[PDB]
Amino acid sequence: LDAVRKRPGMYIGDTDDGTGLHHMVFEVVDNAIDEALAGHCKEIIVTIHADNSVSVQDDGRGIPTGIHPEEGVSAAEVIMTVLGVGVSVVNALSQKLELVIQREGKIHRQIYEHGVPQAPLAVTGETEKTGTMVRFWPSLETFTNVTEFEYEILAKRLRELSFLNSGVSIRLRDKRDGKEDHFHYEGG
Amino acid sequence: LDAVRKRPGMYIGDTDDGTGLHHMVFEVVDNAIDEALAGHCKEIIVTIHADNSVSVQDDGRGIPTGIHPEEGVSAAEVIMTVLGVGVSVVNALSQKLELVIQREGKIHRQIYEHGVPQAPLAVTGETEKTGTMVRFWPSLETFTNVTEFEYEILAKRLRELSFLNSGVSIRLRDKRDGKEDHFHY
Numbered sequence: 001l002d003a004v005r006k007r008p009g010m011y012i013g014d015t016d017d018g019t020g021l022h023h024m025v026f027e028v029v030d031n032a033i034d035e036a037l038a039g040h041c042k043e044i045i046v047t048i049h050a051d052n053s054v055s056v057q058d059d060g061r062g063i064p065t066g067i068h069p070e071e072g073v074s075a076a077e078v079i080m081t082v083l084g085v086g087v088s089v090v091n092a093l094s095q096k097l098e099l100v101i102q103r104e105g106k107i108h109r110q111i112y113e114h115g116v117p118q119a120p121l122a123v124t125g126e127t128e129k130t131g132t133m134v135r136f137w138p139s140l141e142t143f144t145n146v147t148e149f150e151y152e153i154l155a156k157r158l159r160e161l162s163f164l165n166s167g168v169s170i171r172l173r174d175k176r177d178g179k180e181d182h183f184h185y186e187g188g
Numbered sequence: 189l190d191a192v193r194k195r196p197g198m199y200i201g202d203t204d205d206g207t208g209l210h211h212m213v214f215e216v217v218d219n220a221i222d223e224a225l226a227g228h229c230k231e232i233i234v235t236i237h238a239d240n241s242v243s244v245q246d247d248g249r250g251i252p253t254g255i256h257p258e259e260g261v262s263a264a265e266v267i268m269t270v271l272g273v274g275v276s277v278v279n280a281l282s283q284k285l286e287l288v289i290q291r292e293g294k295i296h297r298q299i300y301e302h303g304v305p306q307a308p309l310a311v312t313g314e315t316e317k318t319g320t321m322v323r324f325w326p327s328l329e330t331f332t333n334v335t336e337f338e339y340e341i342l343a344k345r346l347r348e349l350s351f352l353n354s355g356v357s358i359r360l361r362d363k364r365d366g367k368e369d370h371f372h373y
């Protein structure tokens with residue numbers, strides 16, 4: 001990920017005017033939609049947390065967790081740490097990123113800071129559900145001037161996205177003020 | 189550098205008991221000694237600064253600055269960012285590292301933060317002098333418990349090095365309390 005770290009703007013867009021900041025969310029959402037589309041229930045939830053982190057979760061299959069034969073780490077870690085621009089760009093430019101994967105009856109958890117995993121992906125428990133959750137805190141060493149998420153920017157885009165992605169339920173929650181929206185277009 | 193950032197302990201040594209912390213200095217010192225050995229005056233100066241950083245300077249020829257033909261960045265940057273363990277390890281585990289190279293009539297400078305160059309190596313002025321200087325601020329995200337340099341730990345090692353590298357003068361200065369030593373065999 002050092003190539004992204006060296007020139008963040010070339011990968012995410014403008015890091016000073018808020019456009020790159022919001023691009024972080026939309027990159028994660030694109031992955032979540034892809035996950036949601038492969039399942040039959042298809043729901044994603046985007047939450048703006050009070051600490052100005054954002055989490056995106058889907059109830060899909062859960063991204064793969066098995067050890068990659070060549071890389072020697074979990075598939076999820078490979079996706080997060082090897083160079084849409086890819087979620088690895090978001091990970092690189094996040095001061096913290098939490099990953100939770102529910103798959104095959106197991107809960108997998110991992111934490112990253114500035115793209116660096118704090119430990120290997122670990123099975124911490126059991127679950128009856130499936131899905132992936134990523135919560136990230138944009139790096140304040142990279143994102144300057146505009147550092148807080150604008151609800152309207154997210155809601156507008158998620159609304160547009162719902163019409164292209166039929167059957168996918170999209171929820172947006174702002175924990176700073178309690179605002180909620182639900183974008184679900186059932187065409188097709 | 190992510191392999192280093194991922195398992196700092198495996199590259200530099202224990203990051204909680206002060207071992208790894210001091211090894212950071214010794215890695216830089218190895219490079220400085222090599223550089224000093226190739227020069228005429230043969231002196232390195234190791235300084236513990238009051239803000240808990242350490243600088244190591246030599247009066248050697250200056251490490252190479254030209255663009256690496258294959259990597260496409262300065263040779264110094266290649267050495268600082270591509271995997272003794274190598275100074276790239278120190279760079280990766282330093283929240284800030286400042287590099288100054290005096291060579292071929294010019295002064296060159298570069299800043300890194302957590303091993304990431306903030307800009308390319310750049311010519312900032314002219315000079316008659318030659319040598320290299322690295323000042324590094326160990327990352328406190330990595331180094332825990334023992335975060336302050338112990339003078340005697342540095343002095344002990346530097347003394348051993350002065351006997352082995354007998355033509356080289358080694359100066360140790362502590363700007364916190366003014367203690368200093370001069371190892372020369």
Ligand SMILES: COC(=O)c1ccc(O)c(O)c1
Binds near residue numbers: 031055056
């Ligand atoms: C590559 O997959 C991801 O990074 C990813 C997938 C699904 C999600 O719900 C999410 O928040 C992130």
Ligand SMILES: COC(=O)c1ccc(O)c(O)c1
Binds near residue numbers: 220243245246320322
């Ligand atoms: C690659 O060389 C170095 O990293 C290096 C060389 C000489 C020095 O005086 C120093 O502090 C560092």
Ligand SMILES: Nc1nc2ccccc2[nH]1
Binds near residue numbers: 113116141
């Ligand atoms: N604070 C901070 N910034 C970083 C950039 C790259 C790797 C680790 C880092 N820790």
